[PDB]
């Protein structure tokens, strides 16, 4: 659509036999490292190298490391507000 460069998007990840299967590092403007191509991570629409800003509404700019984990783990599926860039624009 309109407005290109930097846009935010929410990804809904569900819990499976293998779990979420995704790697993420960093605080506040959290950044996703990699995701399981054959798992909830990829199935939910997550790509390698994303900028996760929020998780299930609860922003990642207050909750501690174990805190964010407990929040995400506290539930089968969860939505994550992340940001990326248009590849080849």
């Amino acid at each position: 659509g309109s407005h290109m460069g930097l846009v935010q998007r929410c990804v809904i990840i569900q819990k499976d036999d293998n779990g979420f299967g995704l790697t993420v590092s960093g605080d506040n403007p959290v950044f996703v490292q990699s995701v399981k191509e054959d798992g909830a991570a990829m199935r939910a629409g997550v790509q390698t190298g994303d900028r996760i800003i929020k998780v299930n509404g609860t922003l990642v700019t207050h909750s501690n490391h174990l805190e964010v984990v407990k929040l995400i783990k506290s539930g089968s599926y969860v939505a994550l507000t992340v940001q990326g860039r248009p590849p080849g624009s």
Binding site: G19, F20, G21, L22, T23, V24, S25, G26, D27, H65, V68, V69, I72, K73
Partner: peptide, 8 residues
């Protein structure tokens, strides 16, 4: 180096 990484 980095004390804020989480893998799930």
């Amino acid at each position: 180096v980095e004390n804020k990484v989480t893998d799930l």
